[PDB]
Every structure is written in structure tokens, then in C-alpha cells.
Design a protein around this ligand. Structure first.
Ligand SMILES: Nc1ncnc2c1ncn2[C@@H]1O[C@H](COP(=O)(O)OP(=O)(O)OP(=O)(O)O)[C@@H](O)[C@H]1O
Ligand SMILES: Nc1ncnc2c1ncn2[C@@H]1O[C@H](COP(=O)(O)OP(=O)(O)OP(=O)(O)O)[C@@H](O)[C@H]1O
Ligand SMILES: Nc1ncnc2c1ncn2[C@@H]1O[C@H](COP(=O)(O)OP(=O)(O)OP(=O)(O)O)[C@@H](O)[C@H]1O
Ligand SMILES: Nc1ncnc2c1ncn2[C@@H]1O[C@H](COP(=O)(O)OP(=O)(O)OP(=O)(O)O)[C@@H](O)[C@H]1O
Ligand SMILES: [Mg+2]
Ligand SMILES: [Mg+2]
Ligand SMILES: [Mg+2]
Ligand SMILES: [Mg+2]
Lengths: 743, 680
């Protein structure tokens, strides 16, 4: 119930926005029982409160067809109130609305292009002649007249912001034409409703910022001071500065914006004075909100700062934050991608004391974000955004916006066959037939990738489970560990049993350890991170473990995720394996991997997979419970599995019907999966050699091979060798025997 | 569908540029049926649109010999329209072209060298007398008369930009003469047609940079904002800066350049101030393009950056791209060859959201690059660019340009002994005779090596397959090893199986393991990286693995490449044999080689070949198929080989007829090939 502040509550003034029947730009209608409930009289002026602090004046009337909870209200004041159909607005009477003296209204530039008539007599005089229409400073109204309808913007009113347009009120239209860009930017201004997937964080921010500034007495009587510093921290793209934009657009208090690097100045000491002057500018316009974007830019650790001016700036900020209690009416926010780099003194109680964590949205959060970004988008009927939000597993809101933009560009590509770039104009019918479909979202989802992982992505060959032969039980387990919590989250969480956070693959080389990982990457609907072992190591001190920390943190945001540590022999070898280990850089890397895997334990599933080649050198601390709990032995295929391996490799290759894949398996008593592949590649190469010789033979006399035959496999069989010998197999069993005895 | 934007849809306005017959500078010729198709009347003034947003005005005159798909025009308008014979331009009516009031023309300096008379009366007044010539600002036209034909530049007109030179129109030529260098630079300006091998990338960049600018209504209708950030990445020489230059040249929007290190300044807060001033200037002149060249110079990782000024620069860039005050129709482009070094915050959407990879071109793309680079050059008829493109395997566009320059330099060299360095002038006959032959491409190609490989280059003693005696079967496996996947990639795909890309040579010393590698380096048509074993290893903790990674990454960039390990038992030994071996780095290097050879990445045409004296210490993982899958045993020569080895050594050696090499093979039984050479 921490979101009770978000709940819009029941107010009699609340009404639903609906299409108008006869309502013009200055009159609205309410139902007669609602008029009697609100004590609203016909002919009274009423005020409508919408989103983004947008307000308008209209006359209230009675309509017997109007629902009680609903209002009849036309589109001009819809755009004025910045609301759409279905929205909830507030209505109250406004007394003491006097006759207007002078108003300055100016047309919209694109609504008057090519128009040279007398604007007053054609447009303003007939519309306001003896109508007594109520207006507001900044109102937009559409007037019919001349050869094309014209919209105007009110620029000045006398008095302001409310007055009555009387027949003797001075109305003039001279002035510079208002550009469309300003009106469009004001219309597309961001509000709270733009924000999705962070309702809890939105409630926290509102009750930390808006409620104290709006009602300081409500806190005063109970005797608790408002929170003076709020820190918004999270991974890039989550919507921190979007929250800042929403607050700045829909708060009552004056808003001051500070960008960290902007504080810097060349003159000696002027940067601290700039921070100071910003704070006193907040002082004069109290109450106020200060937003310090990129706080880590100007607030590093003073223990680690090598510059005098930066250290002075941090200390000056600390002094200002300490005095912020003396201010009593100023609230400061800060957004940072790395909260850990900020000096801890700025995180002490009384300085950024309450920290809000803007996190990765869930499935319903991603659905909300997608719906928000598709509100201006035009969609067909086949589109279902719930599936799209389901398929985006680790995507942050910025990634979802990128997905929507890519899908729109894909629809534009689909229409690019008809549209011509070099054309001076675009046809109307082609423009109208343009629309976004499910196929565009599916293409975008194909090309979609979280921005956090673009540095860990690798191009993996196309591998599907049918490509892998044998290991049928192993395949089921891998789907039973990965696919069930991904597809059935409710089952696992309800039971409450602790999961295995690892599956170590130990087996002879070429038996499918890496292919199973490729199958996970291509099929399983979870973000995949492939870590080649010795990538994380760095010769420079401290960074080698840092790369381990960031990678483990990197998979943390994108849960569901699979962290594939290929060849654990390098990063995680036995403690004391380097008996000297004077530097300890390898040892500290092994310890760091231990810290992270034990460090995180929560509902969101992050699977760590290691495809070790020879598992005995691995530190057993990795294999001990709590880390890599489940182990799968990837064995050499038997006679039945080998036939599947031969079929899976040869399924895309045209082969003779005479070739018996069952016969080849029993001859290959001990061959691995890779060895069976070499038999097929060797046979394929021999067929190519014949085809090259055949085509040379035919062209030589003038101046082939449709499929691999039985003789081709016969010639390729003699070159075949058994890669992994019997002695190598025993050690792989020996590791299992030692673990089984301990188990 | 990806390159749908690059389709040049056929419209009647699209016409082929053709030579002139009797036309002067101010007219072009169209076929009568095509005129009736577009309702064009003879004598009408029309507006011509060409490359690089270049416009010209010409009069339409009918010709029965003019093709319906072609338009006749002279050299002057073609140089005005920045097009060539065989290009496509758009022709449309240009009404309301008024009579000129007063125009300013300035002659070209090199056409007036030695002319001291009144340029007006000598050239211009006869040129425009009762002609009503249509002219446009910036046009270049040549006038005959006097002592030498003189070109003129129209720098200003009244009205603008189109007017007709009427008899009363004032034509004055006073002013500062125009430099030749400026005209040359403008004529050799770089456009979208100068970039080859990047059709997908050009499609993406045109969709991002050109399409929203030219049609800012499609996105308004569909209700989205097109991506406003492009990050071009790839190995050096692929053309990222070239694509930036083409975009700057061919766009109408204001274009601002930001070189990386130019931002840095002495005084505190001047780097942030410079970035802010650039972005504010772009915002004022919206729509605009900002190009940040060498972005990794000023945008490194904040967590990996020591100096606080650099982190402040990164934060300022982050706030400028996306902050509380969003950008106003500004597109930001950047080019780096290390996209991973860029800070992770810059890569998300609302920033460098679209990352476009300028990869190494394949055969057809590099043929396109060669055609682009040879359009200005003059070549003999015997040349074949297709063969030159086929032979250049790992070359990048810069390397192809270097090949062209080297070939032209060889063409100059061939004509050197005729001409003199200290002579005042070159013989005109030598200049006319001068041309680039196929021999010059062949020589430049022989000396041509990729830029990526200018470090891993060694001198090889030029061994041929005939130098190696015996090993007849092994040679056939080696020749078809590298030839088949590159010469016939279709055959593998038709049979649908991956080629084998690994060979291990093991045998007694002196039997030709290193010799076979020498022959591969010369005879085989693929890049060759030869590295001895221990050279990769380094004192530092992570360097020894990073060295292995960059060699394999370098071989991938140069595919098809052969990566030969001279003593593979050095760098690839059995793990666990020595506990505490060094810092454990030797075992980790084996792991690095293991993942690079066969891992989760897609495998290119990189053939890994290794030779080892003692293969028993080789790590069994390295021997697994998919890594050195073929284990070739090169044993001591039999009697038949011992004859061949003796003959191969002495093939260039004058020997007596009486000595019988056949007997020598029978006496030696366990002799190695090195031992046989010792006798010789
Ligand atoms: N929860 C959300 N709901 C709706 N839109 C969102 C949400 N989160 C992000 N976006 C959108 O995705 C983009 C995120 O950019 P923005 O700069 O606001 O994110 P940020 O995480 O605060 O940034 P940074 O980490 O760089 O400070 C914007 O286009 C924003 O509108
Ligand atoms: N079950 C299988 N079905 C089909 N192909 C297989 C199978 N097992 C192995 N292969 C083949 O072997 C190769 C896969 O080797 P992989 O990298 O998975 O081996 P590994 O057991 O992880 O060994 P290592 O990492 O020690 O070399 C591919 O060429 C693949 O075609
Ligand atoms: N695709 C291409 N088409 C035509 N010419 C090309 C192409 N790529 C490179 N070139 C040629 O190579 C040079 C372009 O170098 P450029 O500065 O664009 O490379 P780059 O990839 O940006 O390099 P770096 O990353 O080192 O800055 C020019 O001489 C140009 O003619
Ligand atoms: N088959 C051969 N034909 C001709 N010369 C040969 C042959 N085998 C060896 N030689 C001669 O042996 C000498 C060096 O041989 P090479 O370097 O190829 O041996 P290797 O087997 O690779 O040795 P190592 O593994 O010990 O480095 C050269 O003089 C070369 O001419
Ligand atoms: Mg932000
Ligand atoms: Mg593997
Ligand atoms: Mg460059
Ligand atoms: Mg050797």
C-alpha cells in the first residue's frame, strides 16, 4: 500500500473526458444531477484541471444525454488541457472573473501560410462578437473563417490570467508569428504518465518531493522534517532524468537544473561560487527543487581526487548540503549511473539520506513502457504488446524505445519500395496505407539487444537442439533448469526451494559441451553472456578483479541471464595450483568469482555455466554447494547416440540412401562427436575434389556429384582417428568417483 | 529489403547523361517522344538536378537521334552538374526564371594566366549577345576567343538563383580571381558514390541521416522519432571518415566537425565549454549533423579513467546528448576503431544508439572499391579489375587505394629513363604515351600486403612446391586445404558442410615440416601469419593472453589467412604437468588458444597449422577435431623420396652427368631431408 499516493482517489469534481455534442471552444456541459451535486449553475464559468499543469476556462451547461461521471468537452480544449479521451479532470467554480481589458493573441505560423486577409475582421471580431467567451493566458483556439481555419495563441491578457472577452475588450493581432515548433514541444512535454515500470519509485519520489513542498504543515504538525536530499541511482536507460523531466514539468515549486560539468569555470574559484549562486537562486525562489545530473562528475572520492578545485567543489557541496537544513524549503535531487563513486560523506544521514533505486522493469513494467511509447504510434489489430513485453527479458525502457523506433523504421523500409527518396513530394495514399504490424515488432525483437550486455555480445553460429545429437536426458535437464523458471516463474517462487546457480559441464573434448551452450544462446529466451576465460584478466592491478565484478554485475541487470564461463580451467584453478602465487592476481580473481556467486541470491534467475575440459584442476570451492551445485557429465556418445549425431550433421547435407548411418556408429566404438563430424567433412571434401576434377574434365574436352556416395564415406573412414583415448576417459570418471565419495 | 532505400526507382525524369552533338553550354537535348511523355516544349528552360545537390539550368532542344532514355549534354554542364557519362540525373520544368538584372562573374585564374586584355569585350559580350542564356549561381562556363579559351565562375546574380541573361542585363567581371585549387577540390569532392563495399551500411546511414531530413513527414505520420545517433566502427582504413566526409558533402543540413583531441584546452572548464559551444551552435542551426572523429580519444570509460577532467568531459557529452533539455533535431555521428573502449553509458538509446559496423569488404565489394579508385586513372584495355580484386584477399579500402597508387608509381617508373628530373618540362609525347598497364597492377599486387598484418611480416626464402621433394600426398592435402574453401565456397555449401581448417605437422626433425609452411607462404593464395611459439608470452599478467587474442583477431580480419605455429609444443603444452608453472600463465594461454580456435564465435576462413617435434606433450584439447583436426605424420623419406630430395636440392646446382643420384638414395637409409642436404 506504498502506492496509495499514486491512486487518484474519488473526488466529485472528477469527470471523464468525452466527445462533444454541440459544445464549442468556450462552453462545456455536465449532467443535471452532477450540476446539482456540485452546485453548478448554467451560465457559470468553470475551471478544468488537466495534466502538466494545464488549465482552461469554459461555461458549464446541462445535457440529459451526458453520464454523471462524464463530461461533454470538445477537442480544442482537449488539446488545451493536454488530455485524451478517458482522462480524469477536476472542475471547480471560479468567482470574480471580471471583464477583459486588453488581450494579445497571435496566430500559428503554419495555419496562416499564404493568408493575407485582415485577420481581425475576418477571424477575431465575428468569433468574439457578443459571445463573452472566457479565455486564459496561453489558450489555443480554432476559428473558422477566410479560406482556411486558423488557430491562435493568447500571449497577453489584461488582467491575467483570467478575464472575460467583452465587446469593449481590446483585441489585437499584430506581432511576430508563433512557430509551430514551440507549440509541438509544449504539447509533447513529459509527465508522470509517461513513466512506466517504476510506480513504486514514482510513489517514493512523489511522497519525498511533491508532498512536502505542497503541504509543509502536514509534516510540521506531526513533527518530522522533510527529506532534503534524494539520490536516484541505476543502470543507464532506466529513466532517472525522465523522472527529473516529469517532476520539472508537473511540480508547483520552482525548478533549478544543475549539470555537473557545467559548474566548471576557468576563473579561480568561480565554480564553487557557481554552485553557491545556484543554491541562493534556489533560496530566493523558495520553495525550490535542484536537480544535479551526473552527480559523479563533480562528487568523486576526495581521498582519490588529485585536483584542488574538484576537492574544493566537493567540500563546498557538502557545506551546502549541511546548510540545506537551514534552508528549510529546498529539496535537491541527483542522478548517477555509478552511485559507488560518489564520496560517502555525501551519502551520510542528512546528505542524500534517502536513496531511490530506479531498477529494470519487469514484464508488466515493460508492457506499460511499450504502451506508453506506442501511444502516438499507429498500430494494426494484429499487434499484441503483451507478447512483446514478454520477449524483452532484460531490456530497460531505453531499449524498449529503441525497439519501437526500429520497428517503425522497418515499416518505413517495407513502404520504401513505393516511396522514393529523390522525390520532391510524397503521395498521400502511400502515406495513409503505412502502418506498423506484428511483423515489424518481431523483426525488431530479432535485432533487439539490451544496451548493457552491446559490449559482451558475440556472433554465435545458428545451433538448435535438433542440431545436437544424443544427450537426450541432458537436453531435458538443461531445459528443466533454464526454461521452467523463465516460462513458469510462479511455480519456482511459490515453492521457495533454493535453486542451483550452476551446471558444470565436465567431459571429453568434442562431446557437446559448447554446443549445449550454443543451443542455450539460440533457443532459450534468456539473455546470454559468453565469457571466454582469460578475457577478464588484466595486467594492471585491481582491474582484473574489477572486470569480474562488472561482468557479474552486468548479468545482474539482465536477469533472466545465462553467464557461460567457457573453460573454467583458466579463471578458476585450484587454490595453491600456483604454489608461489606471489602476485596473487590469479588468486584474487578466483576469490572475486567466489564473492559474486555467493554474493547474489534472489528471485531473478542468473544461471552460471562452466564447460570445463579437465575439471580436476578447478578449485573445489567452486564445486562445493552454493556454487555450481548441479554437475552434468557429458559422456562419449554410445551406439544409439552416435547414429543421432551422424543424422544431425548430415541432415542439411545430401547423402546417398545406400549409406547406412547405423553401420558407421558401431565401427566408431570410441569416437567423440567431433570425430564423427570429421568423417563427414572428410567425405564431403572428397566429393568436392571429384566435382572439381569432373568439371575440369568436362570443360577440358569441350574446349557431377549430386550427393555423397557410399565410396566417399569409405575413403574418408580410413583417415578417421579416435581423438580421446581410453586413458583420458578414466580420469573423467575418476573426478566423478572422488566427488561421489564426498557426496 | 535492407538496401531498399538504395534502389533508384525508375521514373521518366531519370535520364542517362550523354555527350553533345552541336549543343553549346546552355542547352541540352531530349528526344521528342520523351518530351511528349513529360509535356516539355522546345525552348523551355528546365532545372537539372545532379550529384552533391548540384543544380544547373539548360534549354531543351529536340533531336531525332537522341535516345528516349538518354539526354545529350556538353562537358561544361557535366562539370557543372558533377556527373559523368553514364550517370542518371533528374530534369524538370523551371518556370518563373526572370531576366537578369546584374550578375557577377569571376574568371578562373589558370585560364587567364597571360591574358591582360578586357575580359568582358573579348569573351563575355560576344558570348551573351542576343542569346538569353540561362545561368545559375556557382556555374562554371568556358568561353572561346582571344588567345586562349577562358572559364568563368558566376559568383552572384540578380535575381537569385535562376535568371536569364537578357541584352539589358549588366554583366561585370571585376573582382578577385578565383583560385584553381578551390575549383579542383570542389570537382574532386567526395560523395556517396565514392564509397564501395558498404551497401548495407550506406543504406542504414541514408535511412538515419538522409531520409528523416528529406522527408520529415513520414515519421510525423507514423509518430516516431528516427534514431539520432550513429557510431561507425571497424578496423582502420574501412572508410568511416570517408563516409563522414560523404555525408557532410551530400547533406543540406549544417554539418559540424569535432576532432577528438581538439576539445582539450589549457584552462579549467574549457573542454566542457568547447563541447557545449559546438552543441549549441548545432542547435541554433538545426537541423544539423555533429561528427565526432576519433571518439575514443575523448570518450573513454569513466570507471577506467584516471584524470578527473576526462571524466568530466564524458559526463558533459552524456548530458549534451541526452539530459533534461533534450536535443532539437540534431544528429550526432562518431567514428572509432575501438568501440569497446567507449563508455558504456554512451551506447544506449538516446545517444549513440545505432552502431554501424564498417567491416572488411569481400571480393565484390573490393572490386567496387577498385572501380571507384580507378575512375580518374587511365588504364590500358588489357587490365582486368576482377582478377586484381580476387587476388587481394585481406585488403581493406585503404589498402586498395595504396595498391592503385603503387601501380601508378610503377607506371611512372617505367617511363623514367626517357624523362629527366631536372628538366623544365616533361615531354608531351611521354605524357600522352603514359598509362597504367596490367603489369603494373600485377607488380603492385605482388608488393601489396594488408595494413593489419604491417607488424606480423617476416622475410621468407621463397620456397616453391618443386623445392620440396617427396611428400606428394601431403602437398595435395595442403594445396586443397586452403584453395577449396576460398576458390569454391559454393561447393561446400551445396554439400552443406563446414571446411576443415586445422593441420598439425609432427615428425622427426629435418623432414620438411617448416619447409612445407614456407611453400604455403609463397604458392598458396591466402594471407600468411608466421609466429614462433614463445614470442607471444610476456612478463605481465594479462598481456600473454591478450597477445594470443589479438593474433587470432588479426587473422580473422585478414581471412583467408594461414596462421602457422612454428614450435606448437611451446605455446600449447599439456595443462597440469607443472603445478605452479610460472604464474600459471602458460596454462591460461592454452585456454586462450582453445577458445579462439573453436569457441562460441563463428569461425572464419582462418586455417591454423602447427608443427611440433614431439607431439606427445601436446595438449589433447588442441588435437581435438575442430582444432588441428588433421594430424599429418611426416616420416623419414623412403628410397623414392630420397631420390627426389637429392634432385630438389641440386635442381639449380651444376653437377656432373657421371654421378648417379639414384645410388645415393639406396646407401642412405635413415637419413633425414636435412641430412641429405648436408651431403649435398
Ligand atoms: N520507465 C520508463 N518509462 C517510459 N520511458 C522510459 C522509462 N525509462 C526510460 N524511458 C525512456 O527511455 C529513454 C531513457 O533515457 P533517459 O536519459 O531518461 O534515461 P536514464 O536512465 O535516466 O539516463 P542516464 O542513465 O544516461 O542518466 C528516454 O527516451 C525515456 O523517455
Ligand atoms: N552431439 C553432437 N551432435 C552434433 N555434433 C556434435 C555433437 N557433439 C559434438 N559435435 C561436433 O563437435 C564440435 C563441437 O565441439 P564442442 O566445442 O562442443 O566440444 P567440447 O566438448 O566443449 O570440447 P572442448 O571445449 O574441450 O574442445 C562441432 O564440430 C560439432 O558439430
Ligand atoms: N569503402 C571505401 N570506398 C572507397 N574508398 C575507400 C573505402 N574505404 C576506404 N577507402 C579509401 O581509404 C581512405 C579512407 O580512409 P578513412 O580515413 O576513411 O578510414 P577509417 O576507417 O576512418 O580509418 P581510421 O579508423 O584509421 O580513422 C581514402 O583514401 C579512401 O579512398
Ligand atoms: N622433403 C624435403 N625436400 C627438400 N628439402 C628438404 C626436405 N625435408 C627437409 N629438407 C631440408 O631440410 C632443411 C630444413 O628442413 P625443415 O626446416 O623443413 O625441417 P623440419 O622437419 O620442419 O624441422 P624442425 O621440426 O626440427 O624445425 C632444409 O635445408 C630443407 O631443404
Ligand atoms: Mg539522465
Ligand atoms: Mg568449447
Ligand atoms: Mg578516419
Ligand atoms: Mg622448424
Amino acid at each position: 500500500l506504498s502506492t496509495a499516493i499514486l491512486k487518484q482517489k474519488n473526488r466529485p469534481n472528477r469527470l471523464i473526458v468525452d466527445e462533444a455534442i454541440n459544445e464549442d471552444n468556450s462552453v462545456v456541459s455536465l449532467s443535471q444531477p452532477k450540476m446539482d451535486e456540485l452546485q453548478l449553475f448554467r451560465g457559470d464559468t468553470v475551471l478544468l484541471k488537466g495534466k502538466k499543469r494545464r488549465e482552461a476556462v469554459c461555461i458549464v451547461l446541462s445535457d440529459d444525454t451526458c453520464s454523471d461521471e462524464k463530461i461533454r468537452m470538445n477537442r480544442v480544449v482537449r488539446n488545451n488541457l493536454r488530455v485524451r479521451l478517458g482522462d480524469v479532470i477536476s472542475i471547480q467554480p471560479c468567482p470574480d472573473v471580471k471583464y477583459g481589458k486588453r488581450i494579445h493573441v497571435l496566430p500559428i505560423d503554419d495555419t496562416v501560410e499564404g493568408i493575407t486577409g485582415n485577420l481581425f475582421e475576418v477571424y477575431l471580431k465575428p468569433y468574439f462578437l457578443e459571445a463573452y467567451r472566457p479565455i486564459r493566458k496561453g489558450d489555443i483556439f480554432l476559428v473558422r473563417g477566410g479560406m482556411r481555419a486558423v488557430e491562435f495563441k493568447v500571449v497577453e491578457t489584461d488582467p491575467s490570467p483570467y478575464c472575460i472577452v467583452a465587446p469593449d475588450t481590446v483585441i489585437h493581432c499584430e506581432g511576430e508569428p508563433i512557430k509551430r515548433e514551440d507549440e509541438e514541444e509544449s504539447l509533447n512535454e513529459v509527465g508522470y504518465d509517461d513513466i512506466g515500470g517504476c510506480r513504486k519509485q514514482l510513489a517514493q519520489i512523489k511522497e519525498m518531493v511533491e508532498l512536502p513542498l505542497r503541504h509543509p504543515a502536514l509534516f510540521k504538525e506531526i513533527g518530522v522534517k522533510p527529506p532534503r536530499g534524494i539520490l536516484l541511482y541505476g543502470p543507464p536507460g532506466t529513466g532517472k532524468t525522465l523522472i527529473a523531466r516529469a517532476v520539472a514539468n508537473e511540480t508547483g515549486a520552482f525548478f533549478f537544473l544543475i549539470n555537473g560539468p557545467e559548474i566548471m569555470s576557468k576563473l579561480a574559484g568561480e565554480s564553487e561560487s557557481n554552485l553557491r549562486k545556484a543554491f541562493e537562486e534556489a533560496e530566493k525562489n523558495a520553495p525550490a527543487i535542484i536537480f544535479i545530473d551526473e552527480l559523479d562528475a563533480i562528487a568523486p572520492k576526495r581521498e582519490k581526487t588529485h585536483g584542488e578545485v574538484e576537492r574544493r567543489i566537493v567540500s563546498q557541496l557538502l557545506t551546502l548540503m549541511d546548510g540545506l537544513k537551514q534552508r528549510a524549503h529546498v529539496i535537491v535531487m541527483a542522478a548517477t549511473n555509478r552511485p559507488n563513486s560518489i564520496d560517502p560523506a555525501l551519502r551520510r544521514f542528512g546528505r542524500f539520506d534517502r536513496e531511490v533505486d530506479i531498477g529494470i522493469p519487469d514484464a508488466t513494467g515493460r508492457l506499460e513502457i511499450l504502451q506508453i511509447h506506442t501511444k502516438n504510434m499507429k498500430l494494426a489489430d494484429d499487434v499484441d504488446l503483451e507478447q512483446v513485453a514478454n520477449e524483452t527479458h532484460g531490456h530497460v525502457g531505453a531499449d524498449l524505445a529503441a525497439l519501437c523506433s526500429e520497428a517503425a523504421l522497418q515499416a518505413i523500409r517495407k513502404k520504401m519500395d513505393l516511396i522514393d527518396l529523390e522525390d520532391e513530394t510524397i503521395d498521400a495514399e502511400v502515406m495513409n496505407s503505412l502502418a506498423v504490424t506484428m511483423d515489424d515488432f518481431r523483426w525488431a525483437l530479432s535485432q533487439s539487444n539490451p544496451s548493457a550486455l552491446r559490449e559482451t555480445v558475440v556472433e554465435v553460429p545458428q545451433v538448435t537442439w535438433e542440431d545436437i545429437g544424443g544427450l537426450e536426458d541432458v537436453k531435458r535437464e538443461l531445459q528443466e533448469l533454464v526454461q521452467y523458471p523463465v516460462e513458469h516463474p510462479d511455480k519456482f517462487l511459490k515453492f521457495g526451494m533454493t535453486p542451483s546457480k550452476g551446471v558444470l559441464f565436465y567431459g571429453p573434448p568434442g562431446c557437446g559441451k559448447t554446443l549445449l551452450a550454443k543451443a542455450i544462446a539460440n533457443e532459450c529466451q534468456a539473455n546470454f553472456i559468453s565469457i571466454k576465460g582469460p578475457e577478464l584478466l588484466t595486467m594492471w592491478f585491481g582491474e582484473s578483479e574489477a572486470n569480474v565484478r562488472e561482468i557479474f554485475d552486468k548479468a545482474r541487470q539482465a536477469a533472466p541471464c545465462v553467464l557461460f564461463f567457457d573453460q573454467l580451467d583458466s579463471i578458476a584453478k585450484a587454490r595453491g595450483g600456483n604454489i608461489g602465487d606471489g602476485g596473487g592476481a590469479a588468486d584474487r580473481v578466483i576469490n572475486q568469482i567466489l564473492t559474486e556467486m555467493d554474493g547474489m541470491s534472489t528471485k531473478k534467475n542468473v544461471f552460471i555455466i562452466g564447460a570445463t575440459n579437465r575439471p580436476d584442476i578447478i578449485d573445489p570451492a567452486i564445486l562445493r554447494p552454493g556454487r555450481l551445485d548441479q554437475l552434468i557429465y557429458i559422456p562419449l556418445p554410445d551406439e544409439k547416440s552416435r547414429v543421432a549425431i551422424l543424422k544431425a550433421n548430415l541432415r542439411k547435407s545430401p547423402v546417398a540412401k545406400d549409406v547406412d548411418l547405423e553401420f558407421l556408429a558401431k565401427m566408431t566404438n570410441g569416437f567423440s562427436g567431433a570425430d564423427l563430424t570429421e568423417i563427414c567433412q572428410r567425405a564431403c571434401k572428397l566429393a568436392i575434389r571429384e566435382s572439381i576434377e569432373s568439371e575440369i574434365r568436362r570443360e577440358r574436352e569441350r574446349q557431377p556429384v549430386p550427393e555423397i556416395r557410399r565410396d566417399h564415406f569409405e575413403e574418408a573412414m580410413r583417415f578417421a582417428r579416435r581423438s580421446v583415448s581410453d586413458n583420458d576417459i578414466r580420469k573423467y570418471e575418476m573426478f566423478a568417483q572422488t566427488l561421489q565419495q564426498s557426496r
